[PDB]
Amino acid sequence: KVQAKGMGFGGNRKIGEYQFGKDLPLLEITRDSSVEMCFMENTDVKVVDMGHKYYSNNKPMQFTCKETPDTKTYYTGYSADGYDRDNGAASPTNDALYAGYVIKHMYHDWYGVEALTKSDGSPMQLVMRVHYGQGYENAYWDGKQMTFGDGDTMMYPLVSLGVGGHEVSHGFTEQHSGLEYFGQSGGMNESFSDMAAQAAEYYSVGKNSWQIGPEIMKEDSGYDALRYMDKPSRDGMSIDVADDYYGGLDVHYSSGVYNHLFYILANQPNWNLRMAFDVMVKANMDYWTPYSTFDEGGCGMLSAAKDLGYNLDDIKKSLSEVTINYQSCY
Numbered sequence: 317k318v319q320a321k322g323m324g325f326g327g328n329r330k331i332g333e334y335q336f337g338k339d340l341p342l343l344e345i346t347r348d349s350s351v352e353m354c355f356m357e358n359t360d361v362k363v364v365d366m367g368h369k370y371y372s373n374n375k376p377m378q379f380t381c382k383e384t385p386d387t388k389t390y391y392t393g394y395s396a397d398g399y400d401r402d403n404g405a406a407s408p409t410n411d412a413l414y415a416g417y418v419i420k421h422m423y424h425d426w427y428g429v430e431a432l433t434k435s436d437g438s439p440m441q442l443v444m445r446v447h448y449g450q451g452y453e454n455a456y457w458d459g460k461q462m463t464f465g466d467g468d469t470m471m472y473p474l475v476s477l478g479v480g481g482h483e484v485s486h487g488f489t490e491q492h493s494g495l496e497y498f499g500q501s502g503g504m505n506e507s508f509s510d511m512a513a514q515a516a517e518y519y520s521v522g523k524n525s526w527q528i529g530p531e532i533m534k535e536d537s538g539y540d541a542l543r544y545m546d547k548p549s550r551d552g553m554s555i556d557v558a559d560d561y562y563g564g565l566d567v568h569y570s571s572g573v574y575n576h577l578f579y580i581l582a583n584q585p586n587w588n589l590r591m592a593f594d595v596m597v598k599a600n601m602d603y604w605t606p607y608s609t610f611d612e613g614g615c616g617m618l619s620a621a622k623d624l625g626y627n628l629d630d631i632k633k634s635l636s637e638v639t640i641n642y643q644s645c646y
């Protein structure tokens with residue numbers, strides 16, 4: 317009913333905990349005074365507390381919010397203390413509301429586009445389903461929303477800026493190139509989402525890890541990260557070059573090709589992450605097709621780089637390093 321601000325915590329025991337309202341911005345929430353209730357929703361982002369179930373009516377997480385001794389600001393959580401603790405994270409629900417804000421703003425500030433749009437053309441609200449399932453060690457895009465488990469023994473809750481950027485960006489891809497979720501195109505689809513994870517981190521804080529999931533891997537698990545973009549094969553399953561691709565290799569392992577490509581391109585002399593992501597975003601919007609092969613995708617990057625005025629010999633060197641062929645790209 318009215319806009320309001322939320323104060324509370326985020327993070328986890330591995331990367332550290334922080335405060336919305338001190339370290340990061342206050343959260344944008346809503347309040348209905350007729351019932352003294354606040355809702356983890358704003359125009360752009362809604363957080364659903366799945367309550368460890370697999371299905372929900374998708375109503376926003378709602379909590380009592382009342383004035384206390386000293387828009388209005390309220391502490392988040394069902395106990396009005398800023399917390400929503402689960403599996404070593406301070407508040408996955410606060411982190412998701414903030415994650416959606418950052419990803420929306422990255423696409424707007426860097427590209428002037430909506431992260432998600434409806435079929436009718438209008439902006440589409442980012443729906444973040446948190447606390448999904450029991451011990452669910454994954455997160456995914458389902459065609460209309462983003463779903464995050466709370467993890468288990470190997471992972472903390474899967475709500476971080478990078479994971480949020482990854483999942484939202486599956487929707488961005490679906491609504492642009494439409495890269496299909498199998499074969500080579502599916503590896504490119506997964507890769508673009510890993511690229512967007514890096515972009516979200518760089519946009520927010522000016523540094524990115526070149527890894528996927530280090531902030532959510534439990535230290536006792538023995539894995540520093542889920543994926544490594546500098547050398548995908550460090551995870552024991554992903555591939556570093558297109559010559560190692562085979563039919564049936566899962567999209568989360570064939571993503572190594574474009575992940576490695578993105579790392580290589582962003583680290584060329586005179587390049588950086590932003591320029592590399594500008595090429596990928598433009599290719600996703602204007603050139604890549606739903607059944608793209610890795611080679612056809614490299615031709616789409618060359619056309620995007622030409623549009624942007626970037627150096628095509630730097631693109632070609634990067635494609636060559638991941639064994640993508642471009643001899644037919646004319």
Ligand SMILES: CC(C)C[C@@H](C(=O)NO)C(=O)Nc1ccc(Cn2cc(CNS(=O)(=O)CC(C)C)nn2)cc1
Nearest residue numbers: 453454455456457474479483486506528529542566568
């Ligand atoms: C940061 C991440 C959470 C992002 C997330 C993603 O990309 N979202 O869009 C991702 O990387 N997921 C993912 C990675 C690998 C596989 C391949 N694989 C593993 C297994 C065995 N485990 S399992 O219990 O069967 C399935 C699990 C996953 C429940 N089988 N196939 C499947 C999913």
Ligand SMILES: [Zn+2]
Nearest residue numbers: 482486506509
């Ligand atoms: Zn994914």
